[model samples]
Target: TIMALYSIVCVVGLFGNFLVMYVIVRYTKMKTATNIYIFNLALADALATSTLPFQSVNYLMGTWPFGTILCKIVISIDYYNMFTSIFTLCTMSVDRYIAVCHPVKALDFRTPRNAKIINVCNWILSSAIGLPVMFMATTKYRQGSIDCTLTFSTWYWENLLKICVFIFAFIMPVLIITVCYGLMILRLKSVRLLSGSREKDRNLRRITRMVLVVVAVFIVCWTPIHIYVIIKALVTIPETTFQTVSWHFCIALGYTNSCLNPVLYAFLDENFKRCFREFCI
Candidate 1:
């Protein structure tokens, strides 16, 4: 049943993310920094969604059917795409902050060329970091089932990587977003501005709201998993039935993050909503 649900999520997420990518690339103007960031984000989500078919198989069988090398490659690809999504989102938040906080400087700094360079760097850096995980881990068939497990020697490395991801993906992005968005709201309040007079302000508010939703969703999804890992590492937590259930819950929550992005934008972004209404309705 869980595996069935995972499969459904994979299918819907893949299609939805692909649609988002198409809309951003085809229908919308790609000249602005926000559109450029979202284009990269949609691309990342599409790549990340590619990993789900393999995961559905893994979940259904509780094993890897592919060879060890293939298994490692698939897992590494998934992790790479997932991490790239988070990092791309972080970049988007930074873009939003600059565009809002320093509009004049943003015109100078946040150009299409700069966004392309950042996107390329993000891919290169993510690949460099994630490729080593494949080499460090091994998968094998055992007791009539293929199990993908990290070696004991690599536990520390995995943990360290998770911590780093949490910091980069969640911690720092959230901090910058909170401060930036708060400042934006403060500025609005002080000036008593409305969304009509300033198109940039309106766009900033929309992007800020979307980013806040992303941050909140990320926190809700990842917090459970991080807390579980932290407790298991630091505390004398028993590996009991309760703990097992908790771990599974955390896994579900974390994985759900990958699929939820489309829904977030579809509901939160007015332009997306308008497009969807025009196309589908």
Candidate 2:
């Protein structure tokens, strides 16, 4: 699970995410009230993992074979993934909270069109945050090898941008997701005492557990990389083998979550499991 396995996992990530998107979009039965954020999440996850081959090419060759344009797009999409992913998780939490807690109270307001618009808004904000990374990316020759990397015009802007990313992408979204999920748990506890619709409750509860695990995995996998980024921005560490290993570890951990997502959905969601036979068709 070291060298070749990295690429192996990337392939799995891509296939699994693509299958997820196919299930959501292709299978009419897979479409539902709860799929908007999930579909967006899978789409973003697929685009992010799409860069893994190019990344591995650079890794194997120790040079940027692709020109500046692809380099910029690759790095920018990664940041976009981080932003849109956590933001979607936050939005999903809000949607679930309302569904489980408010139920009939907000029926008129929670239209499919409204949900679709919010998903679009999520992508727009993420792009607004991510494009700066694209603009900053450049391919430069180090001795004879060209490398694709970020070169901030000033140290101040670098620190400011990193700080903003830490706050907006990680901190605020994490806070929202946690609070919403926590309150939803409270509502679930109270609702357990009263009997209403067994059918709807079970489906909601099952999806809730699956999504909670997804969010949990997201936090665990991503926290290290974000910590590594914030530290790298604030101070310079001596160039060492440890930095190389840590970078690899954090990135691999982060991307591994994408593959795990579809796995979780398959195992945890009853509806999703039923549609697998038609996914490849």
Candidate 3:
């Protein structure tokens, strides 16, 4: 069943993200601005994965067993995770782009200390998107059972939030990420002169590719859910088994992206592999 997938995601995502955090923290050499951003990303993945167990229970039972407070907390955490992941990714894309495409300007702003500051600010700012959910999430008895969901006082609140999330969380982030990545690639391809020689350029291109894959996978995972939500909100569609299955699958895919990230780090980046080797040795 879907619960099996959820369990696997929970276990693998938690372990993998923790391993990422461990290696990044354990090694002093791994403390670059880029790595710092990645560390925050791993933290976000861990937080997002942490909620799956609770969601799995709700999915299976069709009701909330946890109390109202937990209902609010869990849903709020969901929104927080959603926004944080997107924002962190957007920030990472832009940072990587600037660090590569405009190192002179980047020299002033791109530092490990600044990355930490940005991530801290990013963490708090993402929570702003979740604030409404924290207050609005509640449990109501329906069909002689309890259902945990967000209840809006008016259509406008629901409409506004739904539209806002789709825009800010999905659309704008995607647009910014795409633009940054594209411009960086354009800069890379157009440039030929550098004192450091081809070695530096090769690594720069490779790093860009790595970040691109991360963004690509995130888009693939989240696009369906965003599309589905928008359609479900704006258009009238009767629920079918396909809708039910697609909703679950879309959610699972999103969670799977976080789990794949550590895998990507291990396979795609030799630096992380070296750190892993040192940790084990």
Candidate 4:
């Protein structure tokens, strides 16, 4: 079941995110700062999804056929992409908030050059954070076969790393997104437009809704995994059928975010929809 689920996610996520990248690249006008962030987000998703096939094959073979080096590389890249994607999403929210709430100030800093610089910084930071995974993950002989898993020197170390991942990857990004969107919405609400401002109001509302939907999807998809990790960390419960099933479900759900974001782009952005229709149809 896990193999089948990952196979489906691999295919759908790869195709969808690649299409997103193609559409953005093919359309020159889609190269704005926000769309650039979306493009990078898709790139991260595609990179992450590219590893799912190996994982699926591993599950089916019931062993880590790829050597320890490859195991570490794959695990490191997976978490690297996760961190990059989350940071990109947070940057998107911040960009939108600035554009909407402080347009004059945004004009000086939110250019394409700065956007690319920010993305590069995000990649560097994410890679640094994920580097430990490569050293920590190893192939272990288990049940007559080798399994790729993390081997912490101590329980305290494992829990400490988990807590850091939870705080930085999940909590920090969510808080930033929520605060940005909240301020954006509040700023939009305080604006009093004349009678001819209906169209302006509508656009602002739509943009706000789109931002909120993106954040909501991310939070909902990741919340289960974080909760499961917290529970496992706090309690020493024996693994049961239910626990195993739920863990797989939560993890797969989190991966499904990669598939969902491109769809959200098509739904929310007129330029993306136009390019998608012309290129992806």
Q: Tens-digit lDDT track for model 2 on 146-233?
A: 8888887676886888788888888988888889888987888876732277776687788889779888988998889888877776
Model 3 Cα shift for residue 249 (angstroms) = 1.7
Q: What is the lDDT of residue 31 in candidate 3?
A: 87
Among the numbered candidates, top TM-score falls to 3
lDDT of 4 by residue, 1-281 (tens): 66666777678888888777777777677677877887788888888888888887765588888799989889988889768978988988988888787666876978887788888889888877788887888888998988889987686888888888888898888888888877876887777752236876576566657767877887788778888878888887798999888888888888888788878877886766777667645
Cα TM-score per model? 0.84, 0.92, 0.93, 0.91
Ranking by TM-score: 3, 2, 4, 1
Q: Of 2 and 4, which scores higher on TM-score?
A: 2
lDDT of each: 0.72, 0.81, 0.82, 0.80
Ranking by lDDT: 3, 2, 4, 1
lDDT of 3 at 51: 77
> Which of 1 and 3 is the better model by TM-score?
3
Candidate 2 Cα errors over 4 Å, as ranges: 193-195, 278-281
Task: Report the lDDT tens digits of candidate 3 across residue range 90-192.
Answer: 8889888888777888878887876789888897887788787798888888887788877887779988998888877887888888788778778877778
Q: Top lDDT: which candidate number? A: 3
- Model 1 residue 12 CA deviation (Å) reads 1.6
